[PDB]
Structure formats: structure tokens, C-alpha cells
Amino acid sequence: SSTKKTQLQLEHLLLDLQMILNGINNYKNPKLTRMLTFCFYMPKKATELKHLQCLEEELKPLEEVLNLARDLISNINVIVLELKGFMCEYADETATIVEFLNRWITFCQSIISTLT
Ligand SMILES: *SCCCNC(=O)[C@H](C)NC(=O)CNC(=O)[C@H](NC(=N)N)C1CCCCC1
Structure with missing residues (x-):
């Protein structure tokens, strides 16, 4: 029940990021x-939960880029804090x-594979 929850x-998290990517690739998006x-900044290595600190640090620019066109940003924030509780x-x-977005989607698939 602990591994399943994780x-x-x-x-x-994976799905949230995908929803963002989808809304950006929608032909209705004018920006x-x-x-x-x-x-955006990317971590040198992305293979461990603690590395989500690198994603957390970018939620601001993420919100700003999307705002150009949130309920999703906040959802990501909550998940991230639950997963990593690092420089x-x-x-x-x-x-x-x-x-x-691609990089993090890939990071999610990787971690999910590992704990299944
Ligand atoms: S490389 C910056 C190109 C100029 N455009 C912008 O600054 C636009 C308005 N905003 C962004 O690019 C959003 N990104 C950031 O805010 C960057 N910070 C992080 N990704 N953490 C900073 C942009 C400005 C230079 C330093 C990085």
C-alpha cells in the first residue's frame, strides 16, 4: 500500500505533465x-526522487509560460513535495x-518502471 501509493x-505527476504538453500542442493555442x-533549466542527472527538487524549482517559469495562452501547476507542486519531502x-x-516537459515525462516513466 506504500509502494502502490508512491x-x-x-x-x-506523469499525467499532469502530459496534460500540459497536450494543451500546448493543441492547434487552438495561439501563443x-x-x-x-x-x-527552462534541466538537471544534469534525473534518475532519483530527490531530483524532483529540480522540477519544483521551475514551477514558476512553467506557470508563466502557460499563462501566455495552474490548477495543474498546484497539483504538480503537491505531488512533488510528497515524493521528495537537495542541491x-x-x-x-x-x-x-x-x-x-518531455524530459520530466520520461523521468516519471523511468521511476514508475523501477518501483513496479
Ligand atoms: S533565456 C531567456 C530568454 C528571454 N525570455 C525570458 O526571459 C522569458 C520572458 N521568460 C523565460 O524565459 C522564463 N525562464 C526563466 O524565468 C528563467 N529561469 C528559470 N528557468 N528558472 C530565467 C530567464 C531569464 C534568464 C535567466 C533564466
Whole structure:
């Protein structure tokens, strides 16, 4: 019931990020070009729960980029705090919101695989 809960917490996180990615790729979004000009930071390594601190630190720019077009941001925040309860090392190369979301979706799938 503890491992399952953790798994469910990650599943919601995964889905939340996907919903953001979907709303950005919707042809109804009139600000995709502007959104892509935003710069996001990515962790050098992303293989451990504690690395979610790196995601948490970016929720602000995340909210701002989406606001260009939240109930989801807050949901992510809650999950993240539940998973990691660490000093992040970020890569030099910044990423677009699309790359940023992909990377974390991939991180979620990885961790979910591990604890199943
Ligand atoms: S590389 C910045 C390109 C110029 N555009 C912006 O600054 C726009 C308005 N906002 C963003 O790109 C959002 N990203 C951030 O706020 C960045 N911080 C984090 N990702 N944590 C900072 C942008 C400004 C330079 C330092 C990073």
C-alpha cells in the first residue's frame, strides 16, 4: 500500500505533465511561438526522487509560460513535495518548454518502471 501509493503519486505527476504538453500542442493555442522562446533549466542527472527538487524549482517559469495562452501547476507542486519531502545541479544548455516537459515525462516513466 506504500509502494502502490508512491506509484499512483507518480502516475498523476506523469499525467499532469502530459496534460500540459497536450494543451500546448493543441492547434487552438495561439501563443506556441512565444512559449518556445522561454528558457527552462534541466538537471544534469534525473534518475532519483530527490531530483524532483529540480522540477519544483521551475514551477514558476512553467506557470508563466502557460499563462501566455495552474490548477495543474498546484497539483504538480503537491505531488512533488510528497515524493521528495537537495542541491540541484543544472546542465548548461537550457531547454524549451517542450523539451522540458518531455524530459520530466520520461523521468516519471523511468521511476514508475523501477518501483513496479
Ligand atoms: S533565456 C531567456 C530568454 C528571454 N525570455 C525570458 O526571459 C522569458 C520572458 N521568460 C523565460 O524565459 C522564463 N525562464 C526563466 O524565468 C528563467 N529561469 C528559470 N528557468 N528558472 C530565467 C530567464 C531569464 C534568464 C535567466 C533564466
